[PDB]
Amino acid sequence: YPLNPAVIFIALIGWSAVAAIPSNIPVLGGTGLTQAFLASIQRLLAQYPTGPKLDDPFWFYLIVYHVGLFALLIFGQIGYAGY
Amino acid sequence: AHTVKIYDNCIGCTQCVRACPLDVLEMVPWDGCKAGQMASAPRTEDCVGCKRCETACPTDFLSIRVYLGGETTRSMGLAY
């Protein structure tokens, strides 16, 4: 059934770049939607047991990033329905 | 096996055979009734014993009686 498992990475630029340059200031991210996450993973990446439930820019930009990323890669498989 | 015995009230109106979903009961030409028919149960090894015959047995009291006997593979009616 999975006839065309061609590419995945086209969704990534398809989801980061559509949310990076829109800032939309007064929310959690005063910067863009993805810069407020990729900036907020390198503080925690080098073996940090922190990041509690009050850690807004990590935990919130986990779900609000992956819920569009999942949908846009699923629609990337819908991007092999016209084949 | 469920011993199905068919007594002499069986006036041969064939709701037993048409009611049984297993073809354990057939009709036998028997010159003792008005219709000349009386059911038989040869293949009681396939008999489930669901007593759907005794529902549709329009005799006085139940020409066909289904005695619940042994329980083999087929008579238990399990799928696997």
């Binding site: 059934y1 959690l28 935990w59 | 469920h2 489930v48 669901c50 759907r52 619940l68 008579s75």
Partner: protein, 741 residues
């Protein structure tokens, strides 16, 4: 295409067929040679899809019966407005709502029962309302008794329009099937006309009645200096003082200067701390949002002008590869059978009613609703139980569609029967999820039960013991704390005070407190996940095995309400698709009994109660949940034993009718069990041994006295199990919280 084709003068309106009971079914007009004709007179009285296969005559019968239902609903609501008018203390309640307990029904003075007339203040006694009608009326802006008499009168007038309506639509103007299968128009008028104009016109009522009136009552004016709702529309000068945006007229609306309507309409959320309810500015703005959004939503169905969809060209385009055929067939499924539509509409109606229950405890939408806790309680509880039963009707009427109106020709390789191709893999993983959740939702209670009983309280699942803090609920609850500044940008307060900031105290009574969810509430949520998955197991087993199981490979031939097949296959009692609905009603009583027992005890420990000076806190049970919900001795002691003290000591007082509806509802509960455990092969010749005692005295009844049938004899066991078991919790709840709230 779309047109209206209606037969006129169809059925004569004589009383002739009333003299033939059981005229309707050709299998039943034989006359009663047994008493089972009596009961089958009633179970076949609404098998409209089993009188005659002609869908036109069926569809006329049902569509005319709907107006009978709405006739009873308008008689009922006109009853509520008249009992609010004549019998209630509503005008007195409107003076001080936090002191006067709401009551309408004033019990007639016969032997003793005048003690049921509770002195609820207002200079007049009577049994206390817990339905919360007065909070709906203060939100409506009903000032004096005259609008209740007039609205009850209009309730009778609409009841007459529904009686004359259904009479007019079965007999002397009844439509064809081509009128009924016009479903793009039916959605096109319900999404827009019913719901759209309902919410829009209700926004008109709230803005031009409720906003000035519940601004004047928010100022605290007695209902004498308040003018008529009427008198706000004759001149804007009585509303321009209250909201200066009415001075600009509709000119800022049509110029799209909708910043100017910030006085009338806003997005605040939270709760008004004076009245304890929602801001009616938010609620009127809300119904404008449903108004524009539903009126937009109506126009997606092409009817006459070639503009819009049809359901067919939508469903056929979802031809996904894991289903193969896609939804090819469902528009012929859902426009020929009514039980399928009843399954969908009952499922979504019941789940909407549960959504109603949650959104009424945690965002109390009526003024002074969360300050009289019984109306706060039971409006949660009641919309749960119709919120429950209407789901099982789904599991009934999705089963009936699979038995009666299923057709494999129209329904070949689509999304529907490809489920039935692997219904063993459906029901088997529901089976696994039920056992996994049962161990991990109830074995934790046996565990903490034993660990508290074995003394080793360190080995429990308490706060102090092995903690099971619900991580996700606390996290997204914290997102809702961080709503009104971050993401709901133009908000001011949170979506509720069940999420975020400090509690709301209205008249020394706690409106809503931020609910903390820790390590006991976790396990009750896994109860709810568990007992929802069991009813989903029984009601998907009752639909997927409705027609051709691998045990009995002809249930479509046997029917829907057949009892069984027989003792063969080792016994096949209680095997029909009806019987899974029979079991889903018990598990309905379980699942909702622990939904409301989770409610009425976590919100007597973590929300409700009173406050004293310096912001001090005092719940009704006093924080006695998280140390006590983790066991069952803590559950049965601290809730079902300790909360009984205001039900059981209620004799001599005004709550004593509940003390009668507590005992007798135990009775009916246990009286159900006689119908559940025994069977008609006992009762039939017990009865016939009594028929000997009538034949001896020539008191032989002509209608021969059979016992009940099997499906009846178990259906009555459900219908007493639920009336008895539900009315126990009914009288226990209302007898509990009226003695406090």
């Amino acid at each position: 295409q779309v047109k209206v084709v209606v037969d006129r003068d169809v059925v004569p309106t004589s009383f002739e067929k009333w003299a033939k009971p059981g005229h309707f079914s050709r299998s039943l007009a034989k006359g009663p040679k047994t008493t089972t004709w009596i009961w089958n007179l009633h179970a076949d009285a609404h098998d409209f899809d089993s009188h005659t296969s002609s869908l036109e005559e069926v569809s006329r019968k049902i569509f005319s019966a709907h107006f009978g239902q709405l006739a009873i609903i308008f008689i009922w609501l006109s009853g509520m407005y008249f009992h609010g008018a004549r019998f209630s203390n509503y005008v007195a309640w409107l003076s001080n709502p936090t002191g006067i307990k709401p009551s309408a029904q004033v019990v007639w003075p016969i032997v003793g029962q005048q003690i049921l007339n509770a002195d609820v203040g207002g200079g007049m006694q009577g049994i206390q309302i817990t339905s919360g009608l007065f909070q709906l009326w203060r939100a409506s802006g009903i000032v004096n008794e005259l609008q209740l008499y007039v609205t009850a009168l209009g309730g009778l007038g609409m009841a007459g329009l529904m009686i004359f309506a259904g009479w007019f639509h079965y007999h002397k103007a009844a439509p064809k099937l081509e009128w009924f299968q016009n479903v793009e128009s039916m959605l096109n008028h319900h999404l827009a006309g019913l719901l759209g104009l309902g919410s829009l016109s209700w926004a008109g009522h709230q803005i031009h009645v409720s906003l000035p009136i519940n601004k004047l009552l928010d100022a605290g004016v007695a209902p004498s200096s308040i003018p008529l709702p009427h008198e706000f529309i004759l001149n804007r000068n009585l509303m321009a003082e209250l909201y200066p945006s009415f001075q600009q007229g509709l000119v800022p609306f049509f110029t799209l200067n909708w910043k100017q309507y910030s006085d009338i309409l806003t997005f605040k959320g939270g709760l008004s701390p004076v009245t304890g309810g929602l801001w009616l500015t938010d609620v009127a703005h809300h119904h404008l949002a449903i108004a524009v959004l539903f009126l937009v939503a109506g126009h997606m169905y092409r009817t006459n002008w070639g503009i819009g969809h049809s359901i067919k060209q939508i469903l056929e385009a979802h031809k996904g590869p894991l289903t193969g055929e896609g939804h090819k067939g469902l528009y012929e499924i859902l426009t020929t059978s009514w039980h399928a539509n009843l399954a969908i509409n009952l499922a979504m109606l019941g789940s909407l009613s549960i959504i109603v229950a949650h959104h009424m405890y945690a965002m109390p939408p009526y003024p002074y609703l969360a300050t009289d806790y019984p109306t706060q309680l039971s409006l949660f509880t009641h919309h749960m139980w119709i919120g429950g039963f209407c789901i099982v009707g789904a599991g009934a009427h999705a089963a009936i569609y699979m038995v009666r109106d299923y057709s494999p020709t129209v329904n070949f390789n689509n999304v529907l029967d490809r489920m039935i191709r692997h219904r063993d893999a459906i029901i088997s993983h529901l089976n696994w999820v039920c056992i996994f959740l049962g161990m991990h939702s109830f074995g934790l209670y046996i565990h903490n039960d034993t660990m508290r009983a074995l003394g080793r309280a360190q080995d429990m699942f308490s706060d102090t013991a092995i903690q099971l803090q619900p991580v996700f609920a606390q996290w997204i609850q914290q997102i809702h704390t961080l709503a009104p500044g971050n993401t709901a940008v133009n908000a001011l307060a949170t979506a509720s005070y069940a999420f975020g900031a400090d509690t709301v105290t209205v008249g020394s009574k706690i409106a809503m407190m931020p609910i903390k969810l820790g390590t006991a509430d976790f396990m009750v949520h896994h109860i709810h996940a568990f007992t929802i998955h069991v009813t989903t197991l029984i009601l998907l087993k009752g639909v997927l095995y409705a027609r051709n199981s691998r045990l009995i490979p002809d249930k479509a031939n046997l029917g829907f309400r057949f009892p069984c097949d027989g003792p063969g296959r080792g016994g096949t009692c209680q095997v029909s698709a009806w019987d899974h609905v029979f079991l889903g009603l018990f598990w309905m009583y379980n699942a909702l009994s622990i939904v409301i027992f989770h409610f009425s005890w976590k919100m007597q420990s973590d929300v409700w109660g009173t406050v004293t000076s310096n912001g001090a806190i005092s719940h009704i049970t006093g924080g006695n949940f998280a140390q006590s919900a983790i066991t069952i001795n803590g559950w049965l002691r601290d809730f079902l034993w300790a909360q009984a003290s205001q039900v059981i000591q209620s004799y001599g007082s005004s709550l004593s009718a509940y003390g009668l509806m507590f005992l007798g509802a135990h009775f009916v509960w246990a009286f159900s069990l006689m119908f559940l455990f025994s069977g008609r092969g006992y009762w039939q010749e017990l009865i016939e041994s009594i028929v000997w005692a009538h034949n001896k005295l020539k008191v032989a009844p002509a209608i021969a006295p059979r016992a009940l049938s099997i499906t009846q004899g178990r259906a009555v066991g459900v219908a007493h199990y639920l009336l008895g078991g539900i009315a126990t919790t009914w009288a226990f709840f209302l007898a509990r919280i009226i003695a406090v709230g």
